[PDB]
Design a binder for this molecule. Structure first.
Ligand SMILES: CCCCCCCCCCCCCCCCCC(=O)OC[C@H](COP(=O)([O-])OCC(O)COP(=O)([O-])OC[C@@H](COC(=O)CCCCCCCCCCCCCCCCC)OC(=O)CCCCCCCCCCCCCCCCC)OC(=O)CCCCCCCCCCCCCCCCC
Ligand SMILES: CCCCCCCCCCCCCCCCCC(=O)OC[C@H](COP(=O)([O-])OCC(O)COP(=O)([O-])OC[C@@H](COC(=O)CCCCCCCCCCCCCCCCC)OC(=O)CCCCCCCCCCCCCCCCC)OC(=O)CCCCCCCCCCCCCCCCC
Ligand SMILES: COC1=C(OC)C(=O)C(C/C=C(/C)CC/C=C(/C)CC/C=C(/C)CC/C=C(\C)CC/C=C(\C)CC/C=C(\C)CC/C=C(/C)CC/C=C(/C)CC/C=C(/C)CCC=C(C)C)=C(C)C1=O
Ligand SMILES: COC1=C(OC)C(=O)C(C/C=C(/C)CC/C=C(/C)CC/C=C(/C)CC/C=C(\C)CC/C=C(\C)CC/C=C(\C)CC/C=C(/C)CC/C=C(/C)CC/C=C(/C)CCC=C(C)C)=C(C)C1=O
Ligand SMILES: CCCCCCCCCCCCCCCCC[C@@H](O)O[C@H](CO[C@H](O)CCCCCCCCCCCCCCC)COP(=O)(O)OCC[N+](C)(C)C
Ligand SMILES: CCCCCCCC/C=C\CCCCCCCC(=O)OC[C@H](COP(=O)(O)OCCN)OC(=O)CCCCCCC/C=C\CCCCCCCC
Ligand SMILES: CCCCCCCC/C=C\CCCCCCCC(=O)OC[C@H](COP(=O)(O)OCCN)OC(=O)CCCCCCC/C=C\CCCCCCCC
Ligand SMILES: CCCCCCCC/C=C\CCCCCCCC(=O)OC[C@H](COP(=O)(O)OCCN)OC(=O)CCCCCCC/C=C\CCCCCCCC
Ligand SMILES: CCCCCCCC/C=C\CCCCCCCC(=O)O[C@H](COC(=O)CCCCCCC/C=C/CCCCCCCC)COP(=O)(O)OCCN
Ligand SMILES: COC1=C(OC)C(=O)C(CC=C(C)C)=C(C)C1=O
Ligand code: SF4
Ligand code: SF4
Ligand code: SF4
Lengths: 176, 171, 318, 215, 156, 115, 70, 96
C-alpha cells in the first residue's frame, strides 16, 4: 500500500491564477512562516533551571558503580568473577584469596571507568547483588587517574549511596 | 638554541627596529651554540651513567662562529634584509638600561648585552657531550626549524639547503 | 562643543550595538522555545560586557600567509565607516547638515564593502576568498536597484536633503504612497547588510566563518560591531524614509522617541526574519534582484517621474 | 566543518563554486568493530550495534537479534516482538527528526531543530525508563528483550503520540511551502531509479525515485 | 598591600569575563556529539549560561572532544587545537575520549585524547547525559574562577 | 572642517581599539597556531590561485548600468524646469533605453551564469 | 518568559535616545537657545553674515530689533 | 488581566521575605518563583515543589551557603544533594 507525496496538479481557472499571482507578488507563505515564529515567541520555553532543577530519571538508571554489603556489614562480593567474565570492555580486575577467617573475599576489585561502557551487564551477572550501577552521574574529575577505581573507592561509593541504592533496587527487583 | 630559545629568536626579533646594533660590528665575539635536544639527552645520559658522579661537563656545539657571521646567517635563513651597524659599548649599555625598566619580561637587559658580546670560553680539560655518547648537532641542520616562523609569506616554503652555511672560526 | 557632540553620538551607538547582541540572542532563543542568556547579570544584562571583556583580553592571531597591512586596515575601515554613516541622520537635527545627504549615505555604504573584500583577500585562505567573492556578487546584485528605488522615492521629496523628508511626511507616511518600492527597499537593505536570508559572505554552514574565519579576538569584535551598527543605521534610515515622524520645533524629544521606537521595531523585524527563513543561494539572489526587482523598479521609476507632472504635485526647492 | 555531519574529509574540486569532483575520505571513525566482535561472545557483542548507528539504536539491536535468532533456531514470545516493533517505530521517529532538522540546519533554517529536539528528549526519556540508558540501551536481545515495561509507560507513550502530529504540522508549515526552501531543494540531487538500483541505494533513496519497495 | 588588592580585583574581573563567555568549537566525533546537541537543545539551553558554539577555531575558547579519536583523526584534532588562540580549554567527554572505552584494545583508536592534547575536565559515561556535560562545563567554569594569573605575575 | 573632524575621530577610535587588542593580551605565537585553516588538514594549493568567476558578463553589465544612475539622479532638479514636456520625454526615453538593454541581455541568455 | 527580553530592548532604546536630544540641546546651547540656523544656499549664508556683522559681538545669533533703529 | 500578573509579581517579591531575600534568590539562583517547602537538609539545602508548573520545573532545591568546609554562596553544584533527596529530586520516586 503506497501513496504519492508530490503528484498534484494546480488549478488553471482565473480565480486560482490570480490567487497564485497575489501569493507571488505579496509574499503570503513567508508571512505565514513569520506568524508561526511569532506564535512560538509567546509560548513558555522548555528550559529548566539547572542545577537547581534536574531532569527526570528512573530507578533503572545506570550511573556510577558501587559495591554493597549485607545488613550485618559483611561484604556481599564472594569473588566469583562473573562480572569480570561478562564485562564487554574488560573494565574489571579481580584478585582473591581466603580471608583470615577462611571467608572467600577479594583482595583486588578495580574498575576502569574510562574503559567502562555503562551497560549494566555486571549487575545482571552478579548473583548476590554485590556490584551495582548507582544513580550518581555528576562525578566528573580534573585528572584521568581519578577515574580508575579500586576496591576502597567502590566500597566508599556503596557506603555513601546505599540509602538510595537499596530504595532503587526495592522498586525494580520484581522486574528481574 | 631551539624553538623557544632566547638566542636565535632574540637576533631574529631585532629586525623590527630596522638595523642591527653590534658592538664592534660583532667582529670580536666567538659563539659556540648547542642544540636543546643534545643538552636534554646529555642530562639523561649523565643520570644513567654511574661514572659521572662527581664529574663536571661542558656542553658545546661542533662549530665556533664570529657573532657577525652568526647574525648574518640568522638573517639569511629568515630571508630578512641585514643592516648591521656598529654601536659603542656605553650606548648599548644605556639602551639596555632603558629596556630594563619594563615590569614584564624585558626585551633586552644590560646583563643580556654583556653576555651577548662576550666570547665563549674554551675548557678542553672538561668532559663534553661526546663522553656521554652524544654527537653534537650542527646549527646548520636545525636553524630552519626555529627561523621559518620569522619569514614572510613569499619565503615560507624555502628548503633547508638553500641558505649556504656560514664560515666558522675553528682551530 | 562639537567634539562633545561627536562623542555623545558615537558612544551610545556602541552601547546600543552591544546590547543589540543580547537582544538578538534572547529573541532567537524565545522563538526557539528556549530562554537565551539569563545567568550572567540579571536577565543577561551583563552578557555583552563579559563578551567584550573576554574578546579584548584574548590573543589576536597574525596568519603566517596573510598580508598584515590590509589585514589590519580592513576592520578599522569597517568600524570607522559604520560610525561615520550616522552623522547626517536627522533626529530631528543632523550632526552634519548636508545638501545631498542621501548621496553621502550611498557613497559611504558602497565604500563599506571594501572592508570585507580586503579582509577576505588579506587573510590568504580559501574560505575567506570565497566569502569575499560572494561579497562582490552581492554588491553587483543589489546596488543598481537600491539606487533607482532611492531616486524614485525621493522624486516626491524634491531634494536629497534628509531633513526635508520630515516636512514631506508631515501629514502622511511615505509608506502609503510607495509601498511596493518600500518592500523592494526593505529586501535591498536586508541584502546590503549581509543578513539572513542573504548572509552569504559569512555562510556559517557553508564557509565555516567565511570572510572573517582567520580573525580572532578584537579584530573580530570590530567586524561584529560594524555589522550590528550597520543594521541599526539602515533601519533608522528606512524609518526616516518611509515612516516620517512629526516634529515640533519646540519639543524635538517627541520626534526622537517616535523615531527610535520605529527603528527598534524595524531591527526586531530583522531578527524575526533571520529566525524564520532558510538561506538563499548566492546566484538566486542575483536572479531575484535582476529579473524581478529591476523591471518593476524601472516601471515604478517611470511612474514616479510621470505622476507629479500629471497631477501638478511637483515638490518645491529646485 | 559544521556541515560535514561528523568526521568526513570531502576533498572537493571546484571551478569557481561549481563542483567538478567530490572525493569523500572516510575512516576517521573506524574503530575496528568487527574484529572486536570476533573477540567477544554473542551477548558481549550486542552493545557494539548500539554504537554503530547512534541515532537508530534499537533497530541495530533488532537486526542483530534477528540474525542470532535465525542461527539459534529459536522464536521470541509475541509480547517481545510487539515491544520490538513499538520501539523500532519510536526509534524511526527519533531518526527522522534528526535527519530533517539537521538538513534544514545545514540549509539555513535553525528553528525546527530546537522545536523537535524536545520531542527527542521525551523519546530519550522513554528509552531510559525502559532500559536505564537514554540512548545506548542494549534492550533488545536475541531472546527477546531484557526486561518488561514499567507499569506506567504505555500511558506516557500514548500521551506523546496524541500530540506529535501538531509538531509535524508546525515543521511542515515552516518548510514545505516556503519558496526559499523549494528553491534550495527542488531539482537538487536528482537520481534515476535505474541508477539508484545499480548504485546499491535503499530506503527513501529508492522511494524518492518512484521505486515501490519497503522491507 | 594596595598592589595585591588591585591585582586580585583585576584577576577576579578577567576570570569572570572569561568563564561567563565560553565559546566551544563546533566540533563532534561520534555518539557523544548527540548528547552535546541535546545540551544545546531547549531543555538545557547552554546558551543561557553564555555558551555559544562557533565554527572557526580562531573564535573558540573550549574544545569538547565528543567521541572516539582514531589514529587517522588525531592529526586533525591536534591541528585544530593548535589554531585556538589562548587561553584555551579542553573537555574530554565520554569513555572513548577519556581512555578508549569499548574500543580501547583496537588497532586504530587513540587510548584517550590526553595523549594528543592536555585536558582540563574528564566527563565519564557512555555517553554522559546532557546534564553530566553541563555539570562538567560548570566545573570547568569553577576551575577558571580559581586561577590566579595576575597575582602570580605580581609575586614574581 | 566638522566632517574632517568627525572622520578623524572615528578613524582614531578604531585605530586605538586595534592597538588595545594587539598590545593588552598575552601573545604565544608558534608555527602551528598561525598556519592557515582548512578544517584540520593542510591545504593542497594556494589561496592566490585563479578563482573562476561565472558572472563576468553581469559584472560588465553592472558597470554599464551604474552610469545610468548618474544620468538619472538629477531628475528631482530637472522636474522644476518650465518646459516639462521635453524633460518628461527625455527621462522616459532614457528609462526605455535602459529597459530595452536589460531585455536584450535577458533574452540572449546573458543573465545566466556560466556552468 | 517573553517579557524578560524587555530589559535589553529598554537599554537599547535608552542608548539610542541619547544622540537626538544631545544634538538638540547642544544646538540650542550654542545658538542662543533658538534652533541653529540652516544655510543650504548662498542667500541664507549672506543673511547670517550680515547678522554677524551687525551684532557687534561677532555672533550671528545676537538679534537686534527696533531698539537699534532709534 | 495585566493587573493580575502584576499583582502576582508583587506577591512573588513579598513571598521571598522582602526585597533583600528577593534579590538574594534572583542573584543566587536566577529564579524568583515561590514554591511549597518540602523539607530541609542537615547541610542546609531547602527543597521546594510546585505542581502547577510543567514536568521538570515542578521541583527544585535552594542550596546551602555553607557545606562541609567551603563557602557555597556562589559556588554550587548538583553533587551537593544527599542520596535521599537525590532520589526525590530526580523524580525516581514520588515520596520525599
Ligand atoms: C610619502 C607617502 C608614503 C605613503 C605610505 C602609506 C602608509 C603605509 C606606511 C606603513 C605600511 C607598511 C608597514 C608594513 O609593511 O608592516 C609593518 C610591520 C611589518 O610586518 P612584517 O610581517 O615583519 O613584514 C611583512 C612584509 O613586509 C610585507 O607586508 P605587506 O604585504 O602587508 O606590505 C604591504 C604594505 C607595505 O607598504 C608598502 O609597500 C610601501 C608603502 C607605500 C604605499 C603608498 C601607495 C599609495 C596608495 C595610496 C596613498 C596612501 C596614502 C598616502 C598619503 C600620505 C599622506 C596622508 O603596503 C600597503 O598595504 C599600503 C597601504 C596603505 C594605504 C592606506 C589607504 C587606506 C585605504 C582606506 C580607504 C580610502 C578611502 C578614500 C579616502 O607589521 C606591523 O607592524 C603591523 C602592520 C602595520 C600596518 C598599520 C596600518 C597600515 C599602514 C598605515 C596606513 C596609514 C593611512 C593614513
Ligand atoms: C510591551 C508590553 C509589556 C506588558 C507585559 O509584559 O505584560 C505581560 C502579560 C503576561 O502575559 P503572559 O506572558 O502570556 O503570561 C505568563 C504568566 O502570566 C506569567 O505569570 P507569573 O506567575 O510567571 O508571574 C511573573 C511576574 C513576575 O516576574 C518578574 O517580575 C520578571 C519579569 C521582569 C520584566 C521586567 O511577571 C510580572 O509580574 C511582570 C510581567 C511583565 C512586566 C514588565 O501579557 C499581557 O498583559 C498582554 C500584553 C500584550 C502582548 C503584546
Ligand atoms: C622571547 O622571545 C622574544 C619575544 O617574544 C615574542 C619578543 O617579543 C622580542 C622583542 C620584544 C618586542 C615586543 C619587539 C616587537 C616590537 C616591535 C613591533 C617594534 C615596533 C616599535 C616601533 C615604534 C614601530 C613604529 C615605527 C617607528 C618608526 C614609529 C624579543 C627580542 C624576543 O626574544
Ligand atoms: C545560530 O547560532 C548563533 C547564535 O545563536 C546562539 C548567535 O547568537 C550568534 C552571534 C554571536 C553571539 C555570541 C554574540 C557575540 C557577542 C559579541 C561578539 C560581543 C560584542 C560586544 C562589544 C564588542 C561591543 C562594544 C563593547 C562595549 C561594552 C560597548 C560600548 C563601547 C565603549 C568604548 C563605551 C551567532 C554568530 C550564531 O551563529
Ligand atoms: C571602562 C572600559 C574598560 C573596562 C570595562 C569594565 C566593564 C564593567 C565591569 C563589569 C562588572 C561585572 C562583574 C561582576 C558580576 C558577577 C556577579 C556574581 O555572581 O559574581 C560572583 C563574584 O564575582 C567575581 O568573584 C568577581 C567579579 C568582579 C571582580 C571585581 C570588579 C572589578 C571592577 C573594576 C573596574 C575597572 C576596569 C578596568 C579599568 C582599566 C561570582 O558568582 P558567579 O560564579 O558568576 O555565579 C554563579 C552562577 N550561579 C549564581 C547560577 C550559581
Ligand atoms: C602602547 C604601545 C604602542 C606601540 C605602537 C606600535 C604600533 C605598531 O604598528 O606595532 C605593531 C602592532 C603590534 O604588533 P606586535 O609586534 O605583533 O605585538 C607586540 C606586542 N607583544 O600591531 C598593531 O597593533 C597595529 C596597530 C594599528 C595601527 C594604527 C594606525 C593605522 C591608521 C590606519 C589609517 C587608515 C584607516 C582607513 C579608514 C579611513 C577611511 C576614511
Ligand atoms: C572618503 C570621501 C569623503 C567624502 C566626504 C563628503 C562630505 C560631504 O559631502 O559634505 C559636504 C560638505 C558640505 O557641503 P554641502 O552639503 O553642499 O553644504 C554646504 C552649504 N552649507 O562639504 C564640506 O564640508 C567640504 C569639506 C572638505 C572636503 C572633505 C575633505 C575630506 C577628504 C577625505 C580624504 C581623507 C584624507 C586623505 C587620506 C587618504 C586615506 C589614507
Ligand atoms: C570597548 C570594549 C573593550 C575595550 C578594552 C578594555 C579592557 C580593559 C580591561 C582590562 C582588564 C585587565 C587585563 C588583564 C589581562 C592582561 C593579559 C594577561 O593576563 O597576561 C598575564 C601576564 C602573565 O605574565 P607572566 O606570568 O609573567 O608569564 C607567564 C607565561 N609565560 O601578566 C601580565 O602581564 C599582567 C600585566 C597587567 C596588564 C595591565 C592592566 C592595566 C589595565 C589596562 C586596561 C587597558 C584599557 C585602556
Ligand atoms: C493606480 C496606478 C498604480 C500603479 C500600479 C502600482 C501597484 C503595483 C502592484 C504590484 C506591486 C508588487 C511589488 C512586489 C515587489 C516584488 C516582489 C516579487 O515579486 O519578488 C518575488 C520574490 O520576492 C521575495 O520573495 C523576497 C524574498 C526575501 C524574503 C525576506 C523576508 C520577507 C519579507 C517580510 C516582510 C517585509 C515587509 C516589507 C516592508 C517593510 C517596511 C519598509 C518573486 O520571486 P519568485 O517568487 O521566486 O519568482 C520569480 C520568478 N517568477
Ligand atoms: C548525527 O550525525 C552527526 C552529525 O549530523 C547532525 C554532526 O553534525 C556531528 C558533529 C558536528 C557537531 C559539532 C556535533 C556528529 C558527530 C554526528 O554524528
Ligand atoms: S557496566 Fe558493563 S562495561 Fe561497565 S563494568 Fe559493568 S559490565 Fe563492564
Ligand atoms: S561483584 Fe558479584 S559477580 Fe563480581 S565477583 Fe563479586 S560476587 Fe561475583
Ligand atoms: S563514549 Fe560511548 S557514546 Fe560516547 S562516542 Fe564512545 S561509544 Fe559513543
Amino acid at each position: 500500500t503506497y501513496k504519492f507525496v508530490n503528484m498534484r496538479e494546480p488549478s488553471m481557472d482565473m480565480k486560482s491564477v490570480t490567487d497564485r499571482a497575489a501569493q507571488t507578488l505579496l509574499w503570503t507563505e513567508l508571512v505565514r512562516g513569520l506568524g508561526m515564529t511569532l506564535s512560538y515567541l509567546f509560548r513558555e520555553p522548555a528550559t529548566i533551571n539547572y542545577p537547581f532543577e534536574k531532569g527526570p530519571l528512573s530507578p533503572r538508571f545506570r550511573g556510577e558503580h558501587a559495591l554493597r554489603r549485607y545488613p550485618s556489614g559483611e561484604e556481599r562480593c564472594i569473588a566469583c568473577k562473573l562480572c569480570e567474565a561478562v564485562c564487554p570492555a574488560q573494565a574489571i580486575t579481580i584478585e582473591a584469596e581466603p580471608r583470615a577467617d577462611g571467608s572467600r573475599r577479594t583482595t583486588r576489585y578495580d574498575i576502569d571507568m574510562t574503559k567502562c561502557i555503562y551497560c549494566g551487564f555486571c549487575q545482571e551477572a552478579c548473583p548476590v547483588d554485590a556490584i551495582v550501577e548507582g544513580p550518581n552521574f555528576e562525578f566528573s574529575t580534573e585528572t584521568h587517574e581519578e577515574l580508575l577505581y579500586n576496591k576502597e573507592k567502590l566500597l566508599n561509593n556503596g557506603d555513601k549511596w546505599e540509602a538510595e541504592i537499596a530504595a532503587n533496587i526495592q522498586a525494580d527487583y520484581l522486574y528481574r | 638554541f631551539g624553538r623557544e630559545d632566547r638566542f636565535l629568536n632574540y637576533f631574529a626579533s631585532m629586525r623590527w627596529f630596522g638595523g642591527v646594533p653590534l658592538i664592534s660590528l660583532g667582529k670580536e665575539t666567538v659563539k659556540q651554540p648547542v642544540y636543546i635536544v643534545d643538552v636534554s639527552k646529555g642530562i639523561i645520559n649523565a643520570i644513567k651513567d654511574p661514572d659521572a658522579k662527581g664529574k663536571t661537563f661542558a656542553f658545546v656545539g661542533p662549530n665556533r662562529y664570529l657573532l657577525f657571521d652568526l647574525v648574518q646567517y640568522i638573517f639569511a635563513v629568515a630571508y630578512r634584509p641585514f643592516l648591521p651597524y656598529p654601536l659603542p659599548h656605553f650606548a648599548y649599555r644605556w639602551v639596555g638600561r632603558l629596556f630594563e625598566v619594563s615590569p614584564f619580561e624585558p626585551w633586552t637587559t644590560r646583563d643580556k648585552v654583556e653576555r651577548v658580546h662576550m666570547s665563549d670560553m674554551t675548557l678542553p680539560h672538561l668532559p663534553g657531550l661526546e663522553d656521554l655518547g652524544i654527537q653534537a648537532t650542527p646549527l646548520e641542520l636545525k636553524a630552519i626549524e626555529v627561523l621559518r616562523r620569522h619569514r614572510t609569506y613569499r619565503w615560507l616554503t624555502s628548503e633547508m639547503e638553500d641558505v649556504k652555511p656560514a664560515k666558522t672560526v675553528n682551530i | 562643543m562639537f567634539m562633545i557632540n561627536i562623542l555623545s553620538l558615537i558612544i551610545p551607538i556602541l552601547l546600543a550595538v552591544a546590547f543589540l547582541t543580547l537582544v538578538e540572542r534572547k529573541v532567537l532563543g524565545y522563538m526557539q522555545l528556549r530562554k537565551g542568556p539569563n545567568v550572567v547579570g540579571p536577565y543577561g544584562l551583563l552578557q555583552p560586557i563579559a563578551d567584550a571583556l573576554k574578546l579584548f583580553t584574548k590573543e589576536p592571531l597574525r596568519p603566517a600567509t596573510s598580508s598584515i597591512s590590509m589585514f589590519i586596515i580592513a576592520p578599522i575601515l569597517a568600524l570607522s565607516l559604520a560610525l561615520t554613516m550616522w552623522v547626517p541622520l536627522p533626529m530631528p537635527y543632523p550632526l552634519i547638515n548636508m545638501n545631498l545627504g542621501v548621496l553621502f549615505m550611498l557613497a559611504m555604504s558602497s565604500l563599506a564593502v571594501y572592508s570585507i573584500l580586503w579582509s577576505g583577500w588579506a587573510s590568504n585562505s580559501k574560505y575567506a576568498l570565497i566569502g569575499a567573492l560572494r561579497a562582490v556578487a552581492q554588491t553587483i546584485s543589489y546596488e543598481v536597484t537600491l539606487a533607482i528605488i532611492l531616486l524614485s522615492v525621493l522624486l516626491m521629496n524634491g531634494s536629497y536633503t534628509l531633513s526635508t523628508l520630515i516636512t514631506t511626511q508631515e501629514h502622511i507616511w511615505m509608506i502609503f504612497t510607495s509601498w511596493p518600492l518600500a518592500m523592494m527597499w526593505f529586501i535591498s537593505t536586508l541584502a546590503e547588510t549581509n543578513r539572513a536570508p542573504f548572509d552569504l559572505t559569512e555562510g556559517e554552514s557553508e564557509l565555516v566563518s567565511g570572510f572573517n574565519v582567520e580573525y580572532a579576538a578584537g579584530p573580530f569584535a570590530m567586524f561584529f560591531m560594524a555589522e550590528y551598527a550597520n543594521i541599526i543605521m539602515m533601519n533608522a534610515f528606512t524609518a526616516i524614509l518611509f515612516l516620517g515622524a512629526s516634529h515640533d520645533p519646540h519639543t524635538p524629544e517627541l520626534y526622537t522617541i517616535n523615531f527610535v521606537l520605529k527603528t527598534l521595531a524595524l531591527t526586531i523585524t530583522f531578527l524575526w526574519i533571520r529566525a524564520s527563513y532558510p538561506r538563499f543561494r548566492y546566484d538566486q539572489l542575483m536572479h531575484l534582484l535582476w529579473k524581478s526587482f529591476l523591471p518593476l523598479t524601472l516601471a515604478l521609476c517611470m511612474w514616479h517621474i510621470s505622476l507629479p507632472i500629471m497631477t501638478a504635485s511637483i515638490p518645491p526647492q529646485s | 566543518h559544521p556541515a560535514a555531519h561528523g568526521v568526513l574529509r570531502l576533498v572537493m574540486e571546484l571551478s569557481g563554486e561549481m563542483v567538478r569532483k567530490c572525493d569523500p575520505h572516510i575512516g576517521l571513525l573506524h574503530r575496528g568493530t568487527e574484529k572486536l566482535i570476533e573477540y567477544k561472545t554473542y551477548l558481549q557483542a550486542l552493545p557494539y550495534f548500539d554504537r554503530l548507528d547512534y541515532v537508530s539504536m534499537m533497530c541495530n539491536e533488532q537486526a542483530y537479534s534477528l540474525a542470532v535468532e535465525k542461527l539459534l533456531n529459536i522464536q521470541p514470545p509475541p509480547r517481545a516482538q510487539w515491544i520490538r516493533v513499538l520501539f523500532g517505530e519510536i526509534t524511526r521517529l527519533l531518526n527522522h527528526i534528526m535527519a530533517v532538522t539537521t538538513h534544514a540546519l545545514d540549509i539555513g533554517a535553525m528553528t525546527p531543530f530546537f522545536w523537535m529536539f524536545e520531542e527527542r528528549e521525551k523519546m530519550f526519556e522513554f528509552y531510559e525508563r525502559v532500559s536505564g540508558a537514554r540512548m545506548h540501551a542494549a534492550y533488545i536481545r536475541p531472546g527477546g528483550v531484557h526486561q518488561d515495561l514499567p507499569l506506567g509507560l504505555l500511558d506516557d507513550i500514548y500521551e506523546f503520540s496524541k500530540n506529535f502530529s501538531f509538531r509535524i504540522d508546525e515543521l511542515e508549515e515552516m518548510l514545505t511551502n516556503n519558496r526559499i526552501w523549494r528553491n534550495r531543494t527542488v531539482d537538487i540531487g536528482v537520481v534515476t531509479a535505474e541508477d539508484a538500483l545499480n548504485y546499491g541505494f535503499s530506503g527513501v533513496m529508492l522511494r524518492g525515485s518512484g521505486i515501490q519497495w519497503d522491507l | 598591600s594596595r598592589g595585591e588588592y588591585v591585582v586580585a580585583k583585576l584577576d577576579d574581573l578577567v576570570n569572570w569575563a572569561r568563564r561567563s563567555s565560553l565559546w566551544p568549537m563546533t566540533f563532534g566525533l561520534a555518539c557523544c556529539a548527540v548528547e552535546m546537541m541535546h545540551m544545546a537543545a531547549p531543555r538545557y539551553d547552554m546558551d543561557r549560561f553564555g555558551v555559544v558554539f562557533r565554527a572557526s577555531p580562531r573564535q573558540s575558547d573550549v574544545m569538547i572532544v565528543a567521541g572516539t579519536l582514531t589514529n587517522k583523526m588525531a592529526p586533525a584534532l591536534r591541528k585544530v587545537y593548535d589554531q585556538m588562540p589562548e587561553p584555551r580549554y579542553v573537555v574530554s567527554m565520554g569513555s572513548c575520549a577519556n581512555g578508549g572505552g569499548y574500543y580501547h584494545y583496537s588497532y586504530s583508536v587513540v587510548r584517550g585524547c590526553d595523549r594528543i592534547v592536555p585536558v582540563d575536565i574528564y566527563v565519564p559515561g557512555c555517553p554522559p547525559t546532557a546534564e553530566a556535560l553541563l555539570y562538567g562545563i560548570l566545573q570547568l567554569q569553577r576551575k577558571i574562577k580559581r586561577e590566579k594569573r595576575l597575582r602570580i605575575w605580581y609575586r614574581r | 572642517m566638522n566632517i574632517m573632524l568627525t572622520l578623524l575621530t572615528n578613524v582614531t577610535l578604531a585605530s586605538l581599539l586595534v592597538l588595545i587588542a594587539f598590545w593588552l593580551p598575552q601573545l604565544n605565537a608558534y608555527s602551528e597556531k598561525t598556519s592557515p585553516y582548512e578544517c584540520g588538514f593542510d591545504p593542497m594549493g594556494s589561496a592566490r590561485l585563479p578563482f573562476s568567476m561565472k558572472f563576468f558578463l553581469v559584472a560588465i553589465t553592472f558597470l554599464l548600468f551604474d552610469l545610468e544612475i548618474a544620468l538619472l539622479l538629477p531628475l528631482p532638479w530637472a522636474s522644476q524646469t518650465n518646459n516639462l514636456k521635453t524633460m518628461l520625454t527625455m527621462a522616459l526615453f532614457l528609462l526605455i533605453l535602459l529597459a530595452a538593454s536589460l531585455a536584450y541581455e535577458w533574452t540572449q541568455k546573458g543573465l545566466e551564469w556560466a556552468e | 518568559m517573553w517579557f524578560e527580553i524587555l530589559p535589553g530592548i529598554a537599554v537599547m532604546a535608552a542608548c539610542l535616545f541619547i544622540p537626538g536630544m544631545a544634538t538638540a540641546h547642544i544646538h540650542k546651547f550654542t545658538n542662543g537657545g533658538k534652533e541653529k540656523r540652516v544655510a543650504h544656499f548662498s542667500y541664507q549664508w549672506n543673511l547670517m553674515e550680515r547678522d554677524r556683522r551687525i551684532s557687534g559681538v561677532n555672533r550671528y545669533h545676537v538679534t537686534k530689533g527696533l531698539e537699534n533703529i532709534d | 488581566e495585566l493587573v493580575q500578573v502584576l499583582r502576582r509579581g508583587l506577591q512573588q517579591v513579598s513571598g521571598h521575605g522582602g526585597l533583600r531575600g528577593y534579590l538574594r534568590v534572583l542573584f543566587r539562583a536566577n529564579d524568583v518563583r515561590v514554591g511549597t517547602l518540602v523539607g530541609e537538609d542537615k547541610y542546609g539545602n531547602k527543597y521546594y515543589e510546585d505542581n502547577k508548573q510543567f514536568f521538570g520545573r515542578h521541583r527544585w532545591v535552594i542550596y546551602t551557603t555553607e557545606m562541609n568546609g567551603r563557602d557555597t554562596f556562589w559556588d554550587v553544584d548538583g553533587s551537593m544533594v544527599p542520596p535521599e533527596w537525590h532520589r526525590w529530586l530526580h523524580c525516581m520516586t514520588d515520596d520525599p
